[PDB]
Ligand binder design. Structure first.
Ligand SMILES: NNC(=O)c1ccc(Cn2nnc(-c3ccccn3)n2)nc1
Ligand SMILES: [K+]
Ligand SMILES: [K+]
Ligand SMILES: [Zn+2]
Length: 356
């Protein structure tokens, strides 16, 4: 009821890079975040939600039978065939434990969404790996095998109603290409992504991440890309994007469930992101999202590679979900961030009355 759920399972650490033990998507990303929850005495304040495996029928909510079979077959592959398989995708490493870990990341979030929708908890945090937002219906991409957040939105609809309004806010520094594509023609799942773009120089290097990709057919206006260019964005820019775009659109949509594709790679210290969002910044973003869907928010870990930065930033999010007071939070925005916000406003004003 006025309770916060938490899911963490050390078995998700088994997925590893056998060729490059220093690859940034480390097993210790989740163990360090979990340890930070214990240090801050946040863990004991949460209701512990068990991890479970997603079933193949559950993966079929978003992914093709071919994709599921190929990833599933990797459990039995010798190192040379895992190397060959991983090479078929853009930025993927596979071990014999990868498939099981991807299943545990998905099942953990389904048990979390279930705990929220059955009223066992009000909100929840899922300390999971490998991430999921780059995974497409038919392919793995950018360290992602199955689209955990997209699958969770479909799972939530499968236990309530097909038309359950789900908002996905993706604040990982990378565009969730897989999430956008899965729901592109869908008006029941509003996808809002903030991401470093650099006119396509930043991963995943596609114009699909630009502000003018507003969705297709009945999904027109239900895909909101907030792309950053020419600038090391931080709290002022993220707070402004939430003030002018994320919160007015989300309030008009009136979601019944909020999923956060919460990568912490836009954080200060992240070696891949190059951005400066502070743990207090993430706490303010989380607190804002809690005003939606009667507080039904599920925070799902995506990217984020500086171990101290992700541990502090995610723990700060859990603290906000537990009802703790938002911490003290800057400056005028980078000129290109105003350009980006204004481009999104022009793109989405025809679909949202709150922007007009
Ligand atoms: N949420 N998505 C992501 O977090 C995401 C996905 C894909 C990439 C591409 N990439 N960048 N650096 C690398 C890299 C660095 C060191 C060793 C091997 N690889 N790989 N970046 C980030
Ligand atoms: K994003
Ligand atoms: K959509
Ligand atoms: Zn990322």
């Amino acid at each position: 009821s006025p309770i916060t759920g938490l899911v963490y399972d050390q078995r998700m650490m088994l997925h590893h890079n056998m060729w490059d033990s220093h690859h940034p998507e480390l097993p210790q990303r989740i163990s360090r975040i979990f340890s930070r929850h214990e240090e801050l005495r946040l863990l004991s304040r949460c209701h512990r939600i068990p991890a479970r495996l997603a079933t193949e029928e559950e993966l079929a909510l978003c992914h093709s039978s071919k994709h599921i079979s190929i990833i599933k077959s990797s459990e039995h592959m010798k190192p040379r065939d895992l190397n060959r398989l991983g090479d078929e995708y853009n930025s993927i490493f596979i071990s014999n434990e990868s498939y099981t870990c991807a299943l545990l990341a998905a099942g953990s979030c389904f048990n979390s969404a279930q705990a929220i929708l059955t009223g066992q908890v009000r909100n929840a945090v899922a300390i999971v790996r490998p991430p999921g937002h780059h995974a497409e219906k038919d392919t793995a991409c950018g360290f992602c095998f199955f689209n955990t957040a997209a699958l969770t939105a479909r799972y939530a609809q499968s236990i309530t109603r097909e038309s359950l309004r789900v908002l996905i806010v993706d604040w990982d520094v990378h565009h969730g290409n897989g999430t956008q594509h899965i729901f592109e023609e869908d008006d029941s799942v509003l996808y809002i992504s903030l991401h470093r773009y650099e006119d396509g120089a930043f991963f995943p290097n596609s114009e699909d991440a630009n502000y003018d990709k507003v969705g297709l057919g009945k999904g027109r206006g239900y895909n909101v890309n907030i792309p950053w260019n020419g600038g090391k964005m931080g709290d002022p820019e993220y707070m402004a994007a939430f003030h002018h775009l994320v919160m007015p659109i989300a309030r008009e949509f009136a979601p019944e469930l909020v999923l956060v594709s919460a990568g912490f790679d836009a954080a200060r210290g992240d070696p891949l992101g190059g951005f400066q969002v502070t743990p207090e910044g993430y706490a303010h973003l989380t607190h804002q999202l809690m005003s939606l869907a009667a507080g039904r928010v599920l925070i799902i870990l995506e990217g984020g590679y500086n171990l101290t930065s992700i541990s502090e930033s995610m723990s700060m999010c859990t603290s906000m979900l537990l009802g703790d007071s938002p911490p003290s939070l800057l400056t005028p925005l980078k000129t290109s961030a105003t350009v980006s916000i204004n481009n999104v406003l022009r793109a989405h004003a025809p679909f949202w009355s709150s922007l007009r």
